[PDB]
């Protein structure tokens, strides 16, 4: 069938499926909407509750972070997509406030492979914003000797990637990233990164970063997945 972010089926509660309900994935960069019409197709009780929250684009991500109901988080995320299109897609514009914040985060974090080999393309892309066009195969020939067969190093850089993406896609995306970090199920990260690459063609640095993610997920290394809370 098809997933409704306002009504999500119980079996659809996996990183793959929940990934589809991220706000940027809704492809609404425009036509921000008054909340009343957004919730016009919902129970009158839930309408009076959501109206009672007094939501706006600044605090909505925090209300999403506070709720313990994943269906409520996904719903509020849908509300965020219709209410806050510019805030949602602000990161993909090559020069933006959000893009500058993310750039500062990337320059501040040091990947393990960067610490060992600062000359590598990905390090240059994160620090000095150069070399940001490189295929996953170049990354493989270069850094496969660094990652393959090293779970500690792989998890080390993986957590950093999860922080940087944590600040790319707030709200539901951040929840999914935290879930991935908690469960060590790092391959599920594809479902986020795969949905972010074609969105990122205008931003070269972002494109190269996500390409690096694509390479690193494919490193020959065995990881054990801790239990899930959902």
């Amino acid at each position: 069938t098809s997933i409704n972010c306002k009504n999500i089926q119980s079996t659809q509660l996996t990183i793959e499926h929940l990934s589809k309900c991220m706000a940027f994935y809704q492809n609404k960069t425009s036509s921000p909407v008054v909340i009343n019409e957004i919730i016009s197709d919902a129970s009158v009780d839930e309408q009076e509750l959501i109206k009672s929250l007094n939501l706006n684009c600044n605090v909505i991500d925090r209300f999403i972070s506070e709720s313990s109901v994943i269906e409520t988080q996904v719903y509020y995320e849908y509300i965020k997509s219709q209410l806050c299109p510019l805030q949602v897609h602000d990161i993909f514009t090559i020069n933006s406030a959000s893009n500058i914040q993310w750039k500062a985060l990337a320059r501040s974090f040091t990947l393990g492979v960067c610490n060992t080999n600062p000359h590598k393309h990905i390090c240059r892309c994160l620090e000095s914003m150069q070399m940001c066009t490189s295929t996953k195969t170049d990354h493989a020939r270069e850094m496969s000797i660094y990652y393959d067969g090293h779970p500690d190093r792989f998890e080390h850089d993986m957590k950093i990637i999860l922080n940087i993406m944590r600040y790319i896609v707030p709200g539901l995306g951040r929840v999914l990233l935290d879930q991935i970090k908690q469960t060590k199920d790092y391959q599920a990260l594809r479902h986020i990164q795969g949905k972010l690459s074609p969105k990122s063609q205008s931003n070269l640095q972002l494109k190269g970063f996500l390409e690096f993610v694509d390479f690193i997920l494919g490193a020959n290394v065995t990881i054990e997945k801790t239990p899930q809370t959902l």
Partner: antibody, heavy 118, light 113 residues
């Protein structure tokens, strides 16, 4: 403590191949990778390449990509450097040095060195 | 790739005197994300293997005397010996492990008089 012993000296006529051994003791051989350094009779020190014993994967200086080939036997904790088609330039002393990924390509414990003469 | 040049092929000092050697690099060796200079200092006594003296351009390896100090940033680095002893006479090298491949200096021979 930590020790790296290398094979005895080698005299090889030009055109043949020579293989040098590096026995590691005092640490876990697969946690640190092995670096090989060509020092001519002059003061010059040249980085040949390194090899991760756990990965088996290698990385060579573009200069020595054709001349050198690095392998390892994890059982005996030994690292081998192989030089083929020796010439006049290849006459030099070759060093085997430990490296840890956490401290980029800085070598703390060095082997005894092996003089390869052509 | 990067080329390392050292000030003196050899320098002669008397025992007890303070000595300073230079190592200059073509490209800045400072990675701003971790703020660490990728640079190292080796001591090679006559007919022996190089011993690691200093890594990261400042930190000195365990077992290296307090006399040896290293400092510098960007492209300019210097090794400084407080009171030279007889045992120190040797060839001192510097290494950059920033770019590929790691490259070395010509070496500076401390001779004792």
């Amino acid at each position: 403590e930590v020790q790296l012993q290398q094979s005895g000296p080698e005299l090889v006529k030009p055109g043949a191949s020579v293989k040098v051994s590096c026995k590691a003791s005092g640490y876990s051989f697969t946690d640190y990778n092995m670096c090989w350094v060509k020092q001519s009779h002059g003061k010059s020190l040249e980085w040949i390449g390194y090899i991760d014993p756990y990965n088996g994967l290698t990385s060579y200086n573009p200069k020595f990509k054709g001349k050198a080939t690095l392998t390892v036997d994890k059982s005996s904790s030994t690292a081998f450097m192989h030089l083929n088609s020796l010439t006049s330039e290849d006459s030099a002393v070759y060093y085997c040095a430990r490296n840890y990924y956490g401290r980029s390509y800085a070598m703390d414990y060095w082997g005894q060195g092996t003089s390869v003469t052509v | 790739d990067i080329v390392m040049t050292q000030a003196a092929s050899s320098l002669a000092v008397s025992v007890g005197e303070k000595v300073t050697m230079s190592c200059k690099s073509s490209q800045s060796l400072l990675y701003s994300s971790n703020q660490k200079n990728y640079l190292a200092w080796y001591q090679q006594k006559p007919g022996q293997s190089p011993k690691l003296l200093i890594y990261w351009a400042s930190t000195r390896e365990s077992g290296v005397p307090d006399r040896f100090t290293g400092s510098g940033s960007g492209t300019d680095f210097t090794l400084t010996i407080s009171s030279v002893k007889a045992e120190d006479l040797a060839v001192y090298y510097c290494q950059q492990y920033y770019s590929f491949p790691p490259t070395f200096g010509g070496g500076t021979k401390l001779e004792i008089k």
